[PDB]
Design a protein around this ligand. Structure first.
Ligand SMILES: [Zn+2]
Ligand SMILES: [Zn+2]
Ligand SMILES: [Zn+2]
Lengths: 49, 308, 45, 42, 49, 69
């Protein structure tokens, strides 16, 4: 714990001390590039993509 | 008709063609999936500006403006000199048309996809021998109509005429010409789906109901009534606007909303006599014009519809 | 088709790639993909 | 004269949106920021 | 065995801060390069140097 | 959000005493110190576990379920 470090109890951590949830969100849109080219949400195959 | 200048990555050792190639982007490598040999290394993943090469083609231009220190004299004259360029004059006409299309599409509260399609329709259909004796207003109004239809948010002729002052005859002839041009460049150079057809009445109902402030349940019933209204030959030939309005009116009185035909026709700019005239035809087939579930539950009964 | 859930009326829907993203009952425009029905394993630590 | 074209509602709508989306108070910087939601006190 | 000294011991309110090491540790042997200068790219999230 | 199962420091089970703790506070009109000792929580490590717990799950339960069966 020298020089601004600390010792934490592993047993306390095991029981849930200072445990947290993390959430991350991902955004995506189906853009239309004018009148001809358009995108779609799909599961692409290796033979056509 | 030109030099090849094509690079194809293949494994010299495996010699299998075409090869299995994996792009280890994190490692910056292109490696043969079978033997592991690396084929190319040091692959690459504001300093520039973006442009759309579908509405502007190839045209790089830069503006002239003030800086942190600037004299108005130089700015005024440089803009004066830049305006007098003969080559850029041709495309400025298209850009000016784009500006007015954007203004019309923005004053109409239309989505960005609509104006992009409208501008693309203008560019493709412009600079052709067929559309040279027609007013630019007809061209713009027709392009906007096409753009709205391509976006599945199509409007009506009257709605577009509310902004762009063009009478019906020129509007129709220009629209027919532009559609032929787009079809012509679709084959030689897609364009249309089930939506391109004129009637497509089901698309109008949600907005017409919104203008009247009806609940969503009535709108869905109106859509069902309009969808089934095409089985009757005595009404099927009517305009899609009347087909949608009469169906909406039929449901308005079915759920007993206190809105009279005098205002329904005044709001949707449709003659009241036409509304009531069409309503009479949409009374001999009521059992086929009301959703079975709604009558089954008990929300609506057919005796709430007055009979003449 | 795949099953979704309305975010306001909690109605379970079945949409295809052609159907519009909207609740056919109440008209909401936000749908929640239903939870997967395959079991998921978790350590109790 | 078409009153629907004489008045462009987009002028008011964009100017207020652009100035609030960015911090650029014009047509000063940093006037609008993404609200911290890391914790209630934040 | 007893510690020769006596320890100041009691409850204190501590807070878990936003900085976690697992969101900072990153190493690069080789990886993508920038298009212009052809040097390692910037950013841990992009496998940068 | 909900009561911890164990005391962080020593691991004594404290997740079976929340309702007993609340009932002592409400119906018996006991002070929180007396209630903590009546529940058998002697070490101050265990006392702060129940004394400083915020029951947020009650707030979360006010929102209507995302998916009803
Ligand atoms: Zn190989
Ligand atoms: Zn719903
Ligand atoms: Zn304890």
């Amino acid at each position: 714990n020298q020089e601004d470090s600390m010792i934490m109890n592993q047993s306390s951590i095991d029981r849930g001390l200072f445990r947290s949830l993390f959430f991350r969100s991902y955004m995506d849109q189906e853009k239309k590039y004018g009148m001809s080219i358009t995108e779609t949400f799909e599961k692409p195959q290796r033979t056509n993509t | 008709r030109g030099p090849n200048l094509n690079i194809v990555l293949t494994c010299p050792e495996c010699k299998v063609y075409p090869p299995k190639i994996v792009e280890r982007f994190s490692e910056g490598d292109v490696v043969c999936a079978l033997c592991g040999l690396v084929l190319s290394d040091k692959l690459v993943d504001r300093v520039g500006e973006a442009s759309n090469p579908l509405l502007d083609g190839n045209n790089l231009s830069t503006r002239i403006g003030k800086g942190e220190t600037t004299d108005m004299r130089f700015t005024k004259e440089l803009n004066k000199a830049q305006g007098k360029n003969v080559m850029d004059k041709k495309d400025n006409e298209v850009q000016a048309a784009f500006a007015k299309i954007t203004m019309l599409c923005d004053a109409a509260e239309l989505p960005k996809i609509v104006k992009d399609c409208a501008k693309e329709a203008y560019k493709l259909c412009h600079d052709e021998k067929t559309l040279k004796g027609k007013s630019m207003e007809s061209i713009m109004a027709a392009s906007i109509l096409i753009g709205c239809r391509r976006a599945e948010v199509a409007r009506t002729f009257k709605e577009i005429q509310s902004l762009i002052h063009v009478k019906t005859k020129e509007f129709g002839k220009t629209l027919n010409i532009m559609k032929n041009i787009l079809r012509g460049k679709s084959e030689d150079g897609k364009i249309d789906t089930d939506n391109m057809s004129g009637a497509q009445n089901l698309t109008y109902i949600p907005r017409f109901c919104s203008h009247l402030g009806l609940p969503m349940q009535v709108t869905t019933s109106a859509e069902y009534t309009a969808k089934k209204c095409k089985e009757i030959k005595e009404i099927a030939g009517k305009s899609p606007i009347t087909i949608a309005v009469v169906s909406i009116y039929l449901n308005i009185l079915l759920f007993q909303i206190p809105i009279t035909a005098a205002k329904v026709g005044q709001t949707l700019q449709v003659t009241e006599g036409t509304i009531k005239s069409g309503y009479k035809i949409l009374y001999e087939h009521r059992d086929k014009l009301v959703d079975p579930q709604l009558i089954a539950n008990g929300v609506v009964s057919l005796d709430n519809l007055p009979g003449v | 088709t795949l099953k979704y859930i309305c975010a306001e009326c909690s109605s379970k829907l079945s949409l295809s790639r052609t159907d519009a993203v909207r609740c056919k009952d109440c008209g909401h425009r936000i749908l929640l993909k239903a939870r997967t029905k395959r079991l998921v394993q978790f350590e109790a630590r | 004269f078409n009153m629907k074209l004489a008045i462009n509602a987009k002028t008011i709508t964009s100017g207020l949106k652009y100035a609030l989306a960015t911090g650029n108070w014009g047509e000063r910087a940093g006037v609008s920021q993404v609200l911290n939601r890391y914790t209630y006190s934040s | 065995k007893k510690l020769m000294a006596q320890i100041f011991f009691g409850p204190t309110y501590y807070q878990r801060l936003r900085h976690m090491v697992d969101d900072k540790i990153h190493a690069r042997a080789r990886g993508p390069m920038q298009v212009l200068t052809r040097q390692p790219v910037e950013g841990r999230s992009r496998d940068g140097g | 959000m909900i009561v911890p199962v164990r005391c962080f420091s020593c691991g004594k089970v404290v997740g079976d005493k929340w309702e007993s703790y609340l009932n002592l506070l409400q119906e018996d009109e006991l002070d929180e110190g007396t209630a903590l000792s009546r529940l058998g929580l002697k070490r101050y490590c265990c006392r702060r576990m129940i004394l400083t717990h915020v029951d947020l799950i009650e707030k979360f339960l006010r929102y209507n379920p995302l998916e009803k069966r």
